[PDB]
Amino acid sequence: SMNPPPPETSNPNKPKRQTNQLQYLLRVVLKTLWKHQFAWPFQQPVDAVKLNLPDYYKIIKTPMDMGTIKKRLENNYYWNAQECIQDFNTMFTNCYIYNKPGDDIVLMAEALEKLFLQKINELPTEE
Numbered sequence: 001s002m003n004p005p006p007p008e009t010s011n012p013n014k015p016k017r018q019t020n021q022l023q024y025l026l027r028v029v030l031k032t033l034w035k036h037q038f039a040w041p042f043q044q045p046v047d048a049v050k051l052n053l054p055d056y057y058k059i060i061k062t063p064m065d066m067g068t069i070k071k072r073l074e075n076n077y078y079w080n081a082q083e084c085i086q087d088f089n090t091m092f093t094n095c096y097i098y099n100k101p102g103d104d105i106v107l108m109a110e111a112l113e114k115l116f117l118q119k120i121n122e123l124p125t126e127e
């Protein structure tokens with residue numbers, strides 16, 4: 001099996017805007033997670049071919065990763081902060097679907113999610 005194409009990161013047929021929440025999501029949330037020790041498995045789409053995991057995309061039908069999220073933010077792909085937050089949560093949830101609780105990768109994801117939730121609790125105000 002091939003990899004699927006990666007998630008779309010730009011779309012000129014969607015209106016675009018910058019908001020202080022979206023800016024915060026890039027400059028604080030993404031930045032903070034990205035530089036974490038355990039960020040690396042989540043910085044790009046899962047290359048199931050390289051990892052020789054033919055079952056990964058048989059079960060994960062909404063893949064998501066921070067590389068994609070970062071590009072989406074950089075390309076003003078999101079109109080609402082909640083769209084971006086949903087992408088992070090999808091990424092975490094995917095990990096908790098494919099992998100056994102307590103596995104290495106799950107502990108890693110959990111560490112990131114804790115930091116994620118901490119930064120989101122500090123999200124600035126709408127406008």
Ligand SMILES: CC[C@@H]1C(=O)N(C)c2cnc(Nc3ccc(C(=O)N[C@H]4CC[C@H](N5CCN(CC6CC6)CC5)CC4)cc3OC)nc2N1C(C)C
Pocket residue numbers: 040041042044046051053056094095098099105
């Ligand atoms: C899939 C199931 C499960 C799961 O749920 N997730 C999310 C998951 C995700 N990922 C992995 N693995 C890997 C991930 C990544 C790599 C990599 O090579 N990463 C490299 C990417 C290129 C990097 N860079 C360095 C600087 N370059 C340019 C800068 C200098 C200018 C840019 C290029 C260096 C690091 C290797 C992996 O494994 C060998 N496993 C996963 N697991 C399991 C297998 C448990």
